[PDB]
Structure formats: structure tokens, C-alpha cells
Amino acid sequence: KNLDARLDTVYDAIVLGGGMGGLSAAIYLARYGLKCLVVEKGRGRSFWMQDLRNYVGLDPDTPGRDIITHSTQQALHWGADLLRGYVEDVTDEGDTLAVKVKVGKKDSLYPIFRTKYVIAATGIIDNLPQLEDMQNVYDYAGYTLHVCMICDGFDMWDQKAVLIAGTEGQINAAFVLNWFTPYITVLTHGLCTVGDEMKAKLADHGYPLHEAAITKFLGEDHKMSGVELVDGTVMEATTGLINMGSVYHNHYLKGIEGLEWDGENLVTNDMAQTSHPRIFALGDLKKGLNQVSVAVADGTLAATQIWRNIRRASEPRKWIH
Amino acid sequence: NLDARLDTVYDAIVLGGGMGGLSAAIYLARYGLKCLVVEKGRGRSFWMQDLRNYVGLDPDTPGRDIITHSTQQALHWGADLLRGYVEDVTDEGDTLAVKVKVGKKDSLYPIFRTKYVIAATGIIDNLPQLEDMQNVYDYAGYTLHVCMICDGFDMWDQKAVLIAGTEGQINAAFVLNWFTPYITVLTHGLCTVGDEMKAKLADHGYPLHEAAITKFLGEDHKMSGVELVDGTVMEATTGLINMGSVYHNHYLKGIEGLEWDGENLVTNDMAQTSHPRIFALGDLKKGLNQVSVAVADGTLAATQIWRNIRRASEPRKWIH
Numbered sequence A: 001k002n003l004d005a006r007l008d009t010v011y012d013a014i015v016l017g018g019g020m021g022g023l024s025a026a027i028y029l030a031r032y033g034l035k036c037l038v039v040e041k042g043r044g045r046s047f048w049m050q051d052l053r054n055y056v057g058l059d060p061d062t063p064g065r066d067i068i069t070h071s072t073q074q075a076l077h078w079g080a081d082l083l084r085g086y087v088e089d090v091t092d093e094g095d096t097l098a099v100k101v102k103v104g105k106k107d108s109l110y111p112i113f114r115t116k117y118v119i120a121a122t123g124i125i126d127n128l129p130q131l132e133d134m135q136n137v138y139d140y141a142g143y144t145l146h147v148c149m150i151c152d153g154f155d156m157w158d159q160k161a162v163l164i165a166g167t168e169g170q171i172n173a174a175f176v177l178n179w180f181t182p183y184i185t186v187l188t189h190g191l192c193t194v195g196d197e198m199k200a201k202l203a204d205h206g207y208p209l210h211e212a213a214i215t216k217f218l219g220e221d222h223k224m225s226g227v228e229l230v231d232g233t234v235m236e237a238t239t240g241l242i243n244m245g246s247v248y249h250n251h252y253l254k255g256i257e258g259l260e261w262d263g264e265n266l267v268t269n270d271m272a273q274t275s276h277p278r279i280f281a282l283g284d285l286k287k288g289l290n291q292v293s294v295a296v297a298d299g300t301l302a303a304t305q306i307w308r309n310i311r312r313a314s315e316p317r318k319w320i321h
Numbered sequence B: 001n002l003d004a005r006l007d008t009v010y011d012a013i014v015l016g017g018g019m020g021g022l023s024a025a026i027y028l029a030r031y032g033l034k035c036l037v038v039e040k041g042r043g044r045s046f047w048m049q050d051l052r053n054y055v056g057l058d059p060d061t062p063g064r065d066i067i068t069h070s071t072q073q074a075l076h077w078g079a080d081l082l083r084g085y086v087e088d089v090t091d092e093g094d095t096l097a098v099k100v101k102v103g104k105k106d107s108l109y110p111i112f113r114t115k116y117v118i119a120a121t122g123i124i125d126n127l128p129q130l131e132d133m134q135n136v137y138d139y140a141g142y143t144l145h146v147c148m149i150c151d152g153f154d155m156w157d158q159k160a161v162l163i164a165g166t167e168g169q170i171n172a173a174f175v176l177n178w179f180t181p182y183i184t185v186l187t188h189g190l191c192t193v194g195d196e197m198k199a200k201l202a203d204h205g206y207p208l209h210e211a212a213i214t215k216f217l218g219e220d221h222k223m224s225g226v227e228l229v230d231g232t233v234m235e236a237t238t239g240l241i242n243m244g245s246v247y248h249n250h251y252l253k254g255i256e257g258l259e260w261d262g263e264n265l266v267t268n269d270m271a272q273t274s275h276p277r278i279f280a281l282g283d284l285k286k287g288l289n290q291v292s293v294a295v296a297d298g299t300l301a302a303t304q305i306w307r308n309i310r311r312a313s314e315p316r317k318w319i320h
């Protein structure tokens, strides 16, 4: 009497992360008539995007937080459910997955939800240079101090720029950024000592190098004008690129057997499916390019594959008349 | 300035100024590349009255408004736009040559040279042919849909017609029924349905009518029913046209080394065809046909082209 069992609250899909890719997935899933839950912790990467520069249909000064509010409202309108919480763990239970969510930043509860499918859409977050007063960084990060080169390189064209990079591998970006502007000063923020070979290459390109810790970003109305270092060095710059790496929001999947990883990223096929038949991965979490358009299309593909699977397993709806 | 753009070798020419092509043009211009968008007008997305499911946009946004908006953005970043009809693309080694018909009458045929071509010309759905095609246009894209994944939700549990000309196309009834069981199949006089399929439709309760459609009934773009030439009248508030598509790909048929899957182009994960200088986006490439997918394809193709050109270029050094 296996099929005799009372049906448990089992979602068709749970979308982990309510950002660009996750909300796209949620819109599609709900419009496929599927029961889906979006879990969103708040204050993610796209929330700090002040100007989405390059997305068909949207003005290039649209902030990410406005897209999130718009798309969350659309997802709910079509029938998706939203839970504000922090995903802690995903466990494989065979025909379903179990998702533990931390609800409440303090005095937290840990409800567990069951689902046929999981869409991992939790993305990443860029590391920022750490100053005693982080608000001085936040006043410029995402405005004129950029974290993405393909997003904002055009808006840096031929300006005096700082590249903030903590490793020689991260300093390598100077030799890509120079496409947009040759006027690059490299700042390591006291994080690593640059070797002789790289110092010589930077010098041959004319990119000044300063290794002392940054103490203050100068500017007004979110438009940087320069940078001060703890050793007294002061420089002029109207823009910059932070290339200090990222934190990947993937901890809740590290226990899943049968998942193929590429470093911290998940490897997917052409429908955004991982090697696990019940797990999809979108956007910044999957191996590939990190853009809004890419994440949104991933959500489309994942939701469509899930609908195809569920539809194909269902009984036909007949017309009685 | 036709002669101004003739003697310049473009970094990329975008064929088709729809969803995928304008995405590519926006990225190409913002990569500081010189690109040309060639657009004939009145494409598939132009007939989309409501983009239902695209992050950031109200679900009643018409495609023509997105096209106007994104064409303006592409031009703002530095893309060039030519209103014309791509006739041919020729492989000349390190560059490609693109011939464009300019002017519907008394036409000129400028030929442009470029390092890369982005094929973004999409498809167009076949429509049921009536003596008065305006009767179809009054409902097509409003309540008579051409895409199931786009509009299925908006058909939920409504009385619907499936217009299908082959048994393979009638198969869609057994997918559409997910959204609504109240399906009537209309073959529009195009095919005689075999016995096994007729029995399956009858067993599901989906009525079948094989007579040619003569009129769509309704008001204010809202269907209310359909009339057939044999006098049959039926009630329906929505429908799905499943009659196939014409692919806008003829200008690529002379290129050796392109991998085709039927009429679609096979691409890798950066939307590149098997030809290293040709990318294919959206409805033309093998894959899912949605705005989001086409827009992302444009992102990927433009990024690969920038990577190729930049990596081939000399460093920009700072002379103090």
C-alpha cells in the first residue's frame, strides 16, 4: 500500500534564492501551474546593483532592488509562495529533496520543506576592501567603484581608475581592464606582496602600484574622486574595479552525492540541470558568465524542464460533456 | 550615411534587430566595438502583444515597445542601425561579407565587411490562411496564441481551439490539456486525421472538426468562437495555433561548415555555431524559444566576440 499514503505538503519545486535567476524560475513555474516556494534571505548581490546597464527592456539606471520588488510581486501574482529565510541544507531523500530553512535572524526556527525539485539560485557576493568605516566603501561600491568589468567597463572608458586586487592572479585583470582605460593604478590594499616579475610588467605598462592599505575613498554624491592610503599616498581616480574574489552561496549543497562541481561552481547542461536529476543551478552559481540576462534565461530553462518532467508523469485532463 | 559605413570593417554585424539581436548590440557597443544592426521590421516579437514572463517587465508590455526601447539604447551606446533585409552572407576568410537589400522598391544592395556575424533573424509562425487575413490578425497574438509556454497559463480551463495541420501537430492537444481540458481540434481542411488519432481524441473528449475555418468571432481582440465552411459553429475564448514556422535562415545556406539541426543552427554554450565567425541567437538556434533565452544568447555571443578581438589586440599602456 505504498500509493495509499496521504499526500504530504510536497512542493513541485523550491527555488533557493529570490534574485534574478530565482525569480525568473518562480515566474515560469507558477505560470506552468506548479506549486513553488521561493526562499530569499535578503540583501544579495543584485540588491547592491545600483544601475543595470545592459538588459533588454530596462532603462540603464534601473537598480537591482527595484527589479527584485517588481519580479517578486509578479511571481506571487502568478501563484508562487515566498519565505524570507536562509537555506541551511538540502538533503537527498530519493523521490524528493528536503530543504532546511533558518527563519529569523535571532531566535531562529528551522522548518524543513519537501519538494520534487530544487533550483539552486543563491549566487555569490563580491569581496570588498575592508576599512574601519565600511560605509565609506559602501558609498562608492556599485556607484562609481565597480565589481564587474563587463557590466561597467564602458562607463569607465579612458578614466583614471584604481584596480583593487589582493593576489597576483587578481592583478592580472589590469591586462583586461586596459581595454576600457589605460590609466590604471593597482592597489593591493596591504593584502599581498607583488613579486618582482609582476612589478616589472606593471611598470612596463605604466600602471602605478601601491601596496599600502587603503584608508579612505574620496568623493561626493557617490562619485569617487580619489583614494588615500595609510602611508599618506593620495591619488586621483574617478572610477575603479574591485577584483578581490567572491564568496559562493553553495554551502547547503556540499553534502549531496552525485553533484558535479567546477571549483565552487555547479556544472550544468543546456537546461540548467546539474548532474543530479532533481537539482538545477542558475546564474552566478553555475559555471558560466555572470550577468542578469544569463541568470534570467537559466531560470526559464530550469522551470521548463521541471514542468516537462512533471507534465509527462501526470494523468491527462479529459473533457467530460 | 550609406557610403560612410561601406568602407569600414565592422567588428560585428547583427542580423535581426529583435530581442536577441538588440541584446547583442547593446553589449557589443558597451564593449567599445563597432557594430551594425540590420533589421527589416515587423518580425515575430513585433506581433507579441503581451510579454508575460520576463523579469523586470510588466506582463502587458508589447514587443514593439521593447524593440523601440532597446533600439534606442543600442544607438545610445554606439551601435549603428540599418533598416534593410539581409540577403546573403559570404565567408571571405578573416572577414565575412553581408549583402543587404535597402528599400523595398528601387532597392540598393550594399555589401558590408565584418569580422563576425550574429545571426538573430528568428522565425515566423504560420497562420491559418483565410480570404480576409485581418480576421486572423485581430485575434492572433491577443487571445489566439502561437506559443504554449508563453500563454498557456492565460488559457487555464478556458474553452480552446487547437489549430493543427498534421497529426504531429495535433499531438500538441496532449500537452495543451495540462492547461485546459476543454480542447477542440481544428485541422482547417489541411489533413484527414487517421483512425487511431481520432479514437484517442474521442476518448479524451476533445471534439475534432476537419472543415476549413471561415471566420473568427469575437470583439476587441477577444475571441468568442469560430465558424467553419461546412456551417459548424463553436464557442471558444482562446486557442493555440500549431501550424509550424518559417525560419529566417536562407542567407546562411551558402556557408560551408555550418552544423544544422533541421532548420536550426547548433551552437555551443557561447551561442557560437560550428563556424568560428558566426553566432546564432534565440529562435534561430537549437533550443527554447523565449525572449529571456534570446537576450541571454546575445549577451553570450557579444561577450565571446569581445574576448576574441580584445585578446588579439595590443595592450593599451599608460605613457606618463
Ligand SMILES: Cc1cc2nc3c(=O)[nH]c(=O)nc-3n(C[C@H](O)[C@H](O)[C@H](O)COP(=O)(O)OP(=O)(O)OC[C@H]3O[C@@H](n4cnc5c(N)ncnc54)[C@H](O)[C@@H]3O)c2cc1C
Pocket: A040, A041, A042, A043, A045, A048, A084, A085, A086, A102, A103, A104, A105, A125, A126, A127, A128, A138, A139, A141, A142, A147
Ligand atoms: C557592491 C556592493 C555594495 C554593498 N553595499 C553594502 C551596503 O551599502 N550596506 C551593507 O550592509 N552591505 C553592503 N554590501 C554587502 C557587504 O559587503 C556584506 O556582505 C554584508 O554587509 C553582510 O551582511 P550580513 O552579514 O548581515 O548578511 P549575511 O552575511 O548574508 O548573513 C550572515 C548570517 O546571518 C544569517 N541570516 C542572514 N539572513 C538571514 C535571514 N533572512 N533569515 C535568517 N537568518 C539569516 C545566516 O546564518 C547567515 O550565515 C555590499 C556588497 C557589494 C558587493
Ligand SMILES: Cc1cc2nc3c(=O)[nH]c(=O)nc-3n(C[C@H](O)[C@H](O)[C@H](O)COP(=O)(O)OP(=O)(O)OC[C@H]3O[C@@H](n4cnc5c(N)ncnc54)[C@H](O)[C@@H]3O)c2cc1C
Pocket: A016, A017, A018, A019, A020, A021, A022, A039, A040, A041, A042, A043, A044, A045, A046, A047, A048, A049, A050, A051, A052, A053, A054, A055, A064, A085, A086, A087, A088, A121, A122, A123, A124, A126, A141, A142, A143, A146, A147, A148, A151, A152, A249, A282, A283, A284, A285, A290, A291, A292, A293, A295
Ligand atoms: C554593483 C553591481 C552592478 C551590477 N551590474 C550589472 C549589470 O549592469 N548587468 C548585469 O548583467 N549584471 C550586473 N551585475 C551582476 C548581477 O547582479 C548578477 O549577475 C545577477 O544578480 C546573478 O543572478 P543570480 O540570480 O545568480 O544572483 P542574485 O541575483 O544575486 O540572487 C541570488 C539570491 O540568493 C539569495 N541568497 C543567497 N544565499 C542564500 C541562502 N543561503 N538562503 C536564501 N537566500 C540566499 C541572495 O540574497 C540573492 O537575493 C551587477 C552586480 C553588482 C554587485
Ligand SMILES: Cc1cc2nc3c(=O)[nH]c(=O)nc-3n(C[C@H](O)[C@H](O)[C@H](O)COP(=O)(O)OP(=O)(O)OC[C@H]3O[C@@H](n4cnc5c(N)ncnc54)[C@H](O)[C@@H]3O)c2cc1C
Pocket: B015, B016, B017, B018, B019, B020, B021, B038, B039, B040, B041, B042, B043, B044, B045, B046, B047, B048, B049, B050, B051, B052, B053, B054, B063, B084, B085, B086, B087, B120, B121, B122, B123, B125, B140, B141, B142, B145, B146, B147, B150, B151, B248, B281, B282, B283, B284, B289, B290, B291, B292, B294
Ligand atoms: C504572439 C506572440 C507572443 C509571445 N509571447 C512571448 C512571451 O510572453 N514570453 C516569451 O519569452 N516569448 C514570447 N514570444 C516569443 C518571442 O517573441 C521570441 O521567442 C523572441 O522574440 C525570440 O527573439 P529573436 O531575437 O530570436 O527573434 P525576434 O525577436 O523575432 O527577432 C528577429 C528579428 O529579425 C528580423 N529579420 C528577420 N529576417 C530578416 C532579414 N532577412 N533581414 C533583416 N532582418 C530580419 C525580424 O524582423 C525581427 O525583428 C511570443 C511570440 C509571439 C508571436
Ligand SMILES: Cc1cc2nc3c(=O)[nH]c(=O)nc-3n(C[C@H](O)[C@H](O)[C@H](O)COP(=O)(O)OP(=O)(O)OC[C@H]3O[C@@H](n4cnc5c(N)ncnc54)[C@H](O)[C@@H]3O)c2cc1C
Pocket: B039, B040, B041, B042, B047, B083, B084, B085, B101, B102, B103, B104, B124, B125, B126, B127, B137, B138, B140, B141, B146
Ligand atoms: C501572431 C501573429 C500576428 C500577426 N499579425 C499581423 C498583422 O496584424 N498584420 C500583418 O501584416 N502581418 C501580421 N503577421 C505576419 C503575417 O502572417 C505575414 O508573415 C506577414 O504579413 C508577411 O509580410 P511580408 O509580405 O512583408 O513578408 P516579409 O518576409 O516581411 O517581406 C517579404 C519580402 O519583402 C522584402 N523586404 C521586407 N522588408 C524589407 C526591408 N526593410 N527592406 C527591403 N526589403 C524588404 C524582402 O525581399 C522580402 O523577401 C502576424 C504574424 C503572427 C505570427
